[PDB]
Symmetry: C3
Subunit: 143 residues, 3 copies
């Protein structure tokens, strides 16, 4: 049990449990509800954050972990699939204790407070295809 | 008078009056329209901002007020009810004149320019319960 | 060609082509689809960003790799012409965030946006006291 939720039409209001890794939980939620595609938005507070910064020129990537209290001012992302497997693409903006903002591609975050997310289910297959030139999985609406 | 609006299906486009405190206005809007739960998202510009940072370890909190021109790059939040009243939980990301970003839990903001918000009405009850161990008002899908 | 898309009910999932200017692409999408009003939200990666800061009483271009943590905006019209009001928050290679009014941005990676079509005319009126185009729901 990583969350509780309420279904309202095509949306789920998801309350993630405290001290839970949010990305793991959102993936679990989408797998347990069989969500094909959709959006994820929300807010909350965290005690750990890992962001990834990808360099398209060299293909190097940097994963930075912050270990401090932060407020999620916005988590924005989408749901799709690859080979029928849930694929989340989530970005995030957070505020530190001095109100300065950090932002980027979200890999993980550990809740420390509330975690209030809206998951909209589009009920529609949306797939991605790996682009070997970019090293990225890009939307592919015709597959 | 604090705002003008347009109803479009399950949403309202809300244009807050200039020089008006946005949180007060959004509360008043939701109250006027009897919105039990929903979401709020938008953008605009402000001349004053108050954010709160809560320390879960000591239960200290601080409220910081900025008195300068800022752009709201994103205001994100949700609507629910608590103690017979509208309950708004809003976070925000703002840009300063040097384009640096601040982020956090929004208490108030005074518009100075435009204020353009989308309010979705879920037409369903979502309440909250204060968790005395955390010191936070947490979604309660049962009450 | 600046994008590909998928229509899902009242929404469009828009994938902007790499190396494209996103504001121009989004404007082009809204004109092609005849969108009267709506919302735009999404994420992606960019190599150039121009932000504007309006003094009610300045533009700056950043030339570096950035992640768009959020792009938030709306669609309306003035004199039947598509009007996009877009703000943005980005992360730099040191993870610090920049935020503001979006003039333009060049994609360098993915560009994944959800465009909701409201199917309703929403206009604006120039307010000369402010120097801004403000929503006018009665016109
Ligand atoms: Fe603006
Ligand atoms: Ni909060
Ligand atoms: Ni290329």
């Amino acid at each position: 049990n990583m969350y509780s939720y309420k279904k309202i039409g095509n949306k789920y209001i998801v309350s993630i449990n405290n001290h839970t890794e949010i990305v793991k939980a959102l993936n679990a939620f989408c797998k347990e509800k069989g969500i094909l595609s959709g959006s994820i938005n929300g807010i909350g507070a965290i005690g750990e954050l890992t962001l990834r910064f990808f360099n398209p020129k060299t293909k190097a990537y940097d994963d930075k972990t912050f270990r401090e209290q932060m407020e999620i001012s916005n988590l924005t992302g989408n749901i799709s699939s690859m080979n029928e497997q849930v694929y989340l693409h989530l970005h995030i903006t957070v505020g530190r204790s001095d109100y300065s903002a950090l932002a980027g591609h979200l890999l993980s975050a550990i809740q420390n407070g509330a975690g209030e997310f809206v998951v909209e289910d589009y009920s529609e297959r949306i797939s991605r295809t790996y682009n070997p030139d970019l090293g990225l999985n890009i939307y592919d609406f015709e597959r």
